[PDB]
Design a protein around this ligand. Structure first.
Ligand SMILES: Nc1ncnc2c1ncn2[C@@H]1O[C@H](COP(=O)(O)O)[C@@H](O)[C@H]1O
Ligand SMILES: Nc1ncnc2c1ncn2[C@@H]1O[C@H](COP(=O)(O)O)[C@@H](O)[C@H]1O
Ligand code: SF4
Ligand code: SF4
Ligand SMILES: [Cl-]
Ligand SMILES: [Cl-]
Ligand SMILES: [Cl-]
Ligand SMILES: [Cl-]
Lengths: 255, 255
């Protein structure tokens, strides 16, 4: 019903005279709200380093903030512990529940007013369990409140000259069996980079960790790129060198 | 050092005037020793039906015996129970330890003299744990004692006009996670027959059961037969219809 300018103006009216903390991740959503908050209010983009994202990813987030003149701080957290390594069922809840607690801490030592996150309108019709953990503590989702779409976000990002980066997705999601270890996520990430580089899988690729078995996930059109037996033999041999017991391919290719 | 005729004659000298029970399975090894025992001695080929081999396999064994005039009896056993469904580490030991006990029972109610099995010379340089369980109780392996090779067995089978059947291998081996259930082995067997029929995988094929995940094992030359995405989509969809949670392909193809 409302258009983008009305939404954009509504967004600026909200940030007026507010001390804003953005849960900044480097993604398109969070960066867009971080930039709009920086230009109209006293804003701090806080990145909580869980150990679930690669160094490249955190550096990318830090640089984007320095590029767009977003005031940004990163907090490396010792999050991986024995209670957290187990309980894989609620990892996302615990993950975001902890991040929320650190943001709330930064907010009250800084004595800022609100904390916002880049949750968009589309995200509300999903099973996002960490939005349970986040929207458990007071956490404002302004893009979601103003009915911003994925296109509304991408579109306003172009006008504001924010480059659309390629999405880096949580490494702990590759871990299908407890515990979420630093080494297990490494085992997948190396496997993913090796496959992606030697066989050029630009589209969706995943190497799941299931009890030291690597499960390769790929897209329907990328498929032929690994169908010859010399490519398969190289992947199985290299992924086992990384220490997977068996290397397998999930035959449910993404449509 | 010794030739086949000397071995063959040595074999006939051993069975002379002996009441022989053969642990008959229908395989090339067991059938050959069953036939030579039948023609020179009062012999009974006993098949112990574990629930680990398909009906086709037992029928094939029964028919081969009736075809070669081998006196044969089959004993269906209630072997699958709660202690036996678990303890997958020693399945083979328990498997053969039980079969041995039934053969020993048949032997002493019949008051026969010896029990023999088709263990060949080549088999002695393998980790065969049920030969531990078998050669735990007195169990004579005459082909092994007389240095019979795989070729010595195949060769003498041709002279004696015993057809070489295609080997049917234990279904419980497809089960990689406790428990070895009747339904789980079914889940693999159906999967195997479906893949083997619709895509013509004549060479080595396996569908392992690992916590309701099907792991497809195939040979290097058969590989291209399932490499197109319409073949993969059909297999993943059908094997999940059988009730596997995920359908995966082991990228360690047999050389
Ligand atoms: N480095 C980070 N700093 C702050 N929040 C993060 C970070 N990485 C991931 N998140 C959180 O991850 C959630 C959504 O991203 P994801 O669930 O990882 O795709 C949001 O609630 C973010 O707060
Ligand atoms: N139906 C059967 N009757 C008697 N022994 C069997 C039967 N099926 C399998 N075996 C045993 O299986 C062992 C070797 O075959 P396998 O280990 O199944 O490849 C031998 O010790 C046989 O006694
Ligand atoms: S995917 Fe889950 S574990 Fe990873 S950052 Fe998001 S909520 Fe945390
Ligand atoms: S493979 Fe193992 S379980 Fe199957 S028949 Fe042989 S010893 Fe028994
Ligand atoms: Cl304060
Ligand atoms: Cl979530
Ligand atoms: Cl008696
Ligand atoms: Cl064995």
């Amino acid at each position: 019903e409302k258009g983008l300018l009305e939404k954009y103006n509504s967004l600026l009216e909200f940030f007026k005279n507010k001390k804003v903390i953005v849960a900044y991740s480097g993604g398109v959503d969070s960066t867009l709200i971080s930039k709009i908050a920086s230009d109209n209010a006293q804003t701090l983009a806080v990145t909580i380093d869980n150990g679930f994202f690669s160094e490249n990813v955190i550096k990318k987030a830090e640089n984007r903030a320095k590029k767009y003149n977003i005031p940004q701080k990163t907090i490396k957290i010792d999050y991986l512990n024995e209670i957290t390594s187990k309980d894989l069922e609620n990892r996302c809840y615990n993950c975001k529940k902890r991040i929320a607690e650190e943001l709330k801490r930064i907010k009250n030592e800084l004595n800022y007013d609100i904390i916002v996150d880049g949750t968009i309108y589309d995200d509300i019709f999903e099973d996002r369990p960490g939005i349970k953990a986040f929207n458990e503590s007071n956490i404002i989702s302004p893009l979601s409140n103003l009915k911003f779409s994925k296109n509304d976000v991408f579109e306003l990002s172009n006008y504001l000259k924010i480059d659309i980066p390629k999405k880096d997705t949580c490494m702990a999601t590759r871990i299908l069996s407890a515990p979420i270890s630093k080494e297990n996520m490494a085992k997948s990430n190396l496997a993913e980079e090796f496959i992606k580089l030697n066989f050029h899988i630009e589209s969706y690729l995943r190497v799941r960790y299931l009890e030291n078995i690597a499960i390769i996930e790929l897209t329907k059109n990328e498929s032929e790129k690994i169908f010859d037996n010399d490519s398969i033999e190289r992947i199985n041999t290299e992924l086992k060198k990384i220490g997977f017991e068996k290397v397998v391919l999930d035959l449910n290719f993404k449509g």
